[model samples]
Target chain A: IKIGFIGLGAMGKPMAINLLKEGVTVYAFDLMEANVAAVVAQGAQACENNQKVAAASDIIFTSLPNAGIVETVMNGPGGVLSACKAGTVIVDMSSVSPSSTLKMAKVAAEKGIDYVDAPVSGGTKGAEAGTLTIMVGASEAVFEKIQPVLSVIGKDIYHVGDTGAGDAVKIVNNLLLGCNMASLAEALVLGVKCGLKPETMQEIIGKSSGRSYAMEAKMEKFIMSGDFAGGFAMDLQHKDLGLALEAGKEGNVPLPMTAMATQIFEGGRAMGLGREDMSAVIKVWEQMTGVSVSGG
Target chain B: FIGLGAQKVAAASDIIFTSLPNAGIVETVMNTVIVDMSSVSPSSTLKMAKVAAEKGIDYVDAPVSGGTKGAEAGTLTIMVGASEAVFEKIQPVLSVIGKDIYHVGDTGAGDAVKIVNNLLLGCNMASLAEALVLGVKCGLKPETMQEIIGKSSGRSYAMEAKMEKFIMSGDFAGGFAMDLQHKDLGLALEAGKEGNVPLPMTAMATQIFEGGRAMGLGREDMSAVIKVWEQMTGVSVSGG
Candidate 1:
């Protein structure tokens, strides 16, 4: 089967490569020649632009940075709409705004392009191992058409709703991800403040009612180790959080915790941790209370 | 204890228990009238035993974990510090009041275990509230976050109760109230002071609980401490 891919970053690169492991000939592109070369070196065919990939493939997958890049990739010069044939399926694997995704989906529909939102979780590891949790938003028929190929990349695939639904769920998932990071920070700070051993508190809480995926997997290495280095960056978390709040405002729903979490992440960015892990929100708390929370 | 010293004696039964809010009262009952528990120094479990010895009452220090709701359901987890003979003798009656009972040690031991647990519990709930409410505002479903947190690193009995009965259901009623929780935190802090143990988390949690009380949330569920974060931001983690 012929496939196309773009945005070969840490996650996108591995994901596009995984399609190769599944025996699909993936024609991939990226602004970074090095990233494209990396995946091309692994079995993928190279593309001059998204249009070239879209023009030649049955499906095109994009894993860009945000809504703007996703938009630019589509409507820009040498974009997918420039030379892509009709009936070609465009599957977006990036995390972006639902509203933006919906708008993009509507525009693609006018061009006879079947655009589907299929954002994913399970992080970079899941991408590499082809075990990501894929959340899709498309018509029933489109979902059925894509399931087989999606199965090649993800373990838990969900057909949530239509158009922007995938982005909505992804946004929600990330909103919690950001919030849980900070909340665990709060619990740990307080636990440390109370003179309990950080490890002891974590050991008990990790197995108790207060636990979260953040605490279980994220904490031991990312947080407790005090090196908020390699996980998801705070800037991205802030973007997702802001997008969620925007959705809440547009939907007429109130999200107080997300609001606070946004402020905290924003604070992290302000503290020069925008490029650091989202759990670096602990830095703000530590600075505020003049106390540090150690995981060990 | 000295308080029951002159009171009319009930017919001899299985056992007697002291379940007080703090060692101040617990100490007073165990010994004589006291002012400063710290000055009472060691304030001491041995001193605690001195009173149990004086009473000839075969008393047990049994602190409960189930709060008021547990009390009503007769499902409290009682940590009992008593002699082997007394533990065996009181088994039938304690069974009537509690579902899970632990014979931790001798007299005064249950008080130590209970206060430490209460201190940890207080710290746990406040931290959880800070995390849960914070996460909710960040765009995660309360249920989704709680489920993951329960299986992850931040799990605790406090988080479980808050999520299962209070936060998720949007019903912060019929469980442990804020006042008693604050009271236990204070007790534990005081016990730590007397025992020369440090409880920085307990102190922070105590202050946060104090904020809830300051908001006059004492009458509501213990999970109402989450309201401290909610109240601070003027947003509720419900109806979302």
Candidate 2:
């Protein structure tokens, strides 16, 4: 089956490459000439535009940066709808809002295409390793058809619910992840202030009730090491949280802790760490306390 | 408060556990085999230790950590405040419940370490609630973020058991109640005040616990403090 790929950025490029490596006939496009050229060199059929890519592919997969770009690509003149045939399937793996996913699904339906919101976890490493946890929101039949192709890019795939549910779960899941990272940073800063060695604090917390996957994997490695390079950028995390907070507002649920964490991320972004790894949120705390989170 | 019953237990029981609200209570019931697990002032612990020494009680302030789970599972980290000989004698008995038993220092010193440790713990737990709420608001799944942070450096024993089992479960049942933590924070704050060291985070946490009590979750798990944030922010951290 011919697969169409778009948005070949940090996360997108690796995911699309994994699909091509699996020997699928991949028709790919990206705004960046270099990203498209790189994928084209990797055996993908590079196209000048989304429409041309959509016309040649049976399944179109998007790992765009955000909802706006995804909307523009699918709905603009010479978009997927203008070129793709009926029964073509589109799977969106970007972290977008459920409402946006629903809107896109509606647009796809009008064009006789099936749309699946299949947002993912596991960061870039997970994407590169082809071991991402893909959460899909689509009909059962559509999911079954896409399973084989998705398997090439992701290891663990779950059909969370119908259309938009994948997006809901993704935002909800990311909101907690972002909040937990911030909380872990706050706790570590507090521990250091109390005179415990950062490494000792890490050990104690790792063993204790405070343990979380973020603390276990990301915090000690990147945040504690003071390397704030983007595994997941702070700005993107903040956007995801904004999606979540909006959902909370729409659902009439108040998320206080997450709100405060969002503010911290905002503070980090305001301080110009938006392009840094989401772990750079720790810099906000480090700056506040005048304590170094680098090297133990 | 430690009293005649505690005194009798200290005298009669082969293994004694006395968790008084303060040091005066331990002083009132000085005897052998005493384990002062009170959140008492250090000076008060010293005074009580002097009394215990005079009374010939083979006393140690074996303050067990891990909160309720530690208490229930018998896997608490017990910090010993006794002579090396007394710790050796009691170590075997205490090992039944405590996994990491440390001979921190002499009598009063054990109490000192325990309070200091608890101060960090109480503050950390409060910090966890703050971060959890913040994370939830920021559009992360509380459970997923928890799993991530549990594996990340932002983890703590409080985040694992207390936040997950009690807070995330949305049960709010007190293994260790908010009131109890409030009391513990109080003891720690008093120590901080006496030491002329300000613990603003802990102080803020104590107030949050007070908010929990005001919300009528005094008897609920200390994670109920998350409810204070919930009420303030109107976010539910339940499995959604």
Candidate 3:
């Protein structure tokens, strides 16, 4: 089956190339001509517009920025729904809300097309290496049919629920992710300010109840190295926290920790570190205490 | 031990070890060559040490972790705040009670280190509760979150110890109690106030535990804090 990919940005570009590496016939496009051309450099066909991509392929994957953009690209003038065949599967891999996914799924259902929300974790590196954890929300049959196609890009594909569960799970996961990172940022700062070494805290907490995957994955690789070059971006973490806060408001759940973490990321964004990895949030706390958490 | 009283215990023993509940209670009891193993504030430990010093007594703060299992196994980790001479005197005795013994610093340093560590634990555990609630309310099964986050960056010692056995299994028993966690967070906040360090996250974690206490979950394991979120969000995070 021909696979169509859209929005070849940081994550999408690598994901599309990974598909080509596996000898899959890929049709792709992005508003940025350079992004499309870069993917085309990987022996994939380039489409001029979403409609062209939708018309030429059997399966369309969208990796856009937000829910609004995904909605526009799927149903706008000359969008994917306008030209794609009735049975074509549209898998949205963007980190949008469950409600957003449900709205799009409703529209796709009216068009006799299969709508699958299959959001992923493990970031850009996972996309490039084809080892992402994909949470899929679809009917059991639809999940089974899409599992192989998704397996080409992700290692663990979970059929969590129907229609919007993938987005739900992703938002939930990212919420904790943002909160855990923020908690660790402050905890590390507190430890450093109290005459506790960063390395010591990591070593002790690694074996203690305070340990977390946040500390495990980010401490030495990102924060200690002081090289926030390429990991999960702070801007994206901020966005994910916002998604959780919005979902909490919709569900009437008081997410104080999530809200506080959102503001912490807001500080990171305000500090001009939005482009840095989420662990760079330590800089904000560090500045408040005039103590650097980065060993480098 | 309560009937024996602090004066009698101090008089009867050369080196007394007091494991009380809070700093205020720790102040209520006085000792000589005393190792205050209770998780109290550094400031409190210092004040008690000062009072003991006026009488030519040595008061050491040596807080421990590893809980009852550690106590039974004699493998608890101890952070001691005492002088070189006092630590030398207590080292062999502490070794009998704990496996890992650290002379972190002077007068109140043991309390300082324990407070910092427990601050992280309290915040991590409190936040993990709502995280599980959000996942369950968002349509992800509790087991799915456990399976994925257990491998993902969101995983924590809280998740490892509490998720499957305590929270998900609906057995919030036989672990670190919520009241103890609440007391520790309060101690951390007290230290934050004493040091003028603004611990916003830790303060929120304190309030989360306060809510759990208000719900009368003080005796349950700290994982029982998830019940507060479950009540607020109207979902069963325990896989029920």
Candidate 4:
């Protein structure tokens, strides 16, 4: 079956390639000619625009950065809706608001199309390796139909609930991720201040209750190594937290910890490290305490 | 309640297992056969232990690690502060609830060691939250940063259970709340005051925890203190 792919950034490019490797004819589009050409180089069909790709494919997949772009491409004039036939399927892999996903789903339903909100976990590495954890919210039939295709790009795919549940769960997951990351940084810096070697503290905490995916994988690579390169930017983290805080407010969930963590992110941004890896948040503490936490 | 209950137990029972909140509570509870499991200061613990001995009770300050989970699972690490005879007498009962029971030092040493460890644990948790909130603001993936720390030198049991569980589950449900963390930090601060040692980080951590409780998250998990930071800075460590 032919598939339409949009967005060819870090995660999107690898995911689109995985679909191609599965022998599906992927009609791909991106704003950047080089990105589109790069996917084309990998043997996927390069399309002039979203319209061309949407018209040629049985199913359209989106991996944009946010809801605004996804909304524009799918519902705006000369967008996917204008080009695609009725009964076409749309699978959104981007992390967006539950309301936006539901709104898009409603539009898709009116046109006799199937819409699936399938936000993903795992980082760029997971996407490149085809091991992403896909949390899906869609009808049972749509979930079943997409299982085979999803298998090409993700390892574990769960049908979480109805149309907006995927986004809900994704945001919740991110909320916790944010809180845990902040907790890890706080412990390490305190350890250093207490005269425990950074490595020693890491070892004990990693083996103990404080351990999490963030502590186990990202902190040392970015913060300890003193390389604040972005695998994910602080700005994006701030956005995710904003979504989480908004969701909590709507649901009447009191998220005091998550709320406080958001402030630290803003402070890091104010310090001009918004573009760096989140681990560079240590700079704020280092600045306050006059302590160094780098490993050379 | 445990202290009062221990007093009743000490009246009839030959050996009483009493876990107080601190040494002061132990002093209030029983006169004899008091097995003090509460983590308190060394001097206070010694005084309590001496009182128990005078009352013809075999007192052992066996301070324990492992929080509620360990308590429920019956696998706590008990550190004993007592004489050889008292230690031998309590071994059987102690084995029922704890895995490794160590005879660390003298009468008050167990409580001393336990508080020292707990002080570090409390401070470590506070600092962990601080770093993570900042890291997320700086652009590191929370999960990725956690993974790196778990494998590196910045790891600890507090990081795994207390920090990660509530923070990652998005629950923030209290196993140990911010109020309790603040209490522990207060104890540490008091200890520092006595020893003339500077613990600026612990003091800072205490204030942050107090801020968390002040924000009305006193009953939430200690990890929920990150919320205070998030609310102040507008940074999130979430995945989406």
TM-score of each model's chain B: 0.78, 0.82, 0.92, 0.87
Models 1 onward score TM values of 0.55, 0.55, 0.57, 0.56
Q: Write the per-residue lDDT of candidate 1 for residues A79-116, one digit (tens) a residue.
A: 78666677878998777778878888888888888889
- Comparison by lDDT, 1 against 4, better one: 4
Clashing residue pairs found in predicted model 3: none
Each prediction's Cα lDDT score?
Answer: 0.75, 0.80, 0.85, 0.79
Give chain A TM for each model in order: 0.91, 0.92, 0.94, 0.92
Better candidate number, 1 or 2, judged by lDDT:
2
TM-score of 3: 0.57
Lowest lDDT 10-mer window, candidate 1 chain B?
Answer: B32-41
Model 3: docking quality category: incorrect
- Cα lDDT of model 1 by residue, B1-240, tens digit: 222210222343224443443446656654511111121112355566566567665555666666557778999887776779877877677788789988888766776777777677788888888788678778788878877988998799888767767776777766777897788787777777777887777887887887677667787887888876674455567543
How do all the candidates rank in terms of lDDT, highest first? 3, 2, 4, 1
Q: In model 4, what is chain B's TM-score? A: 0.87
Q: Is candidate 2 or candidate 4 better by DockQ?
A: 4
Give the Cα error of residue A243 in candidate 1, in Å.
1.6
**Residue B90 in candidate 1 has what lDDT?**
74
lDDT of 2 by residue, A1-296 (tens): 88888667777788778987878788888887899888888888889888888899889888776788888888876788768899999988877778888988898898899989998888889989999999999999999999998898889999999999999988888888898888887777777768878789788888999998778777677877778775788898899889898888878998877887897798677667899888888777666446676554
RMSD from true fold, candidate 4: 16.9
TM-score of chain B of 2: 0.82
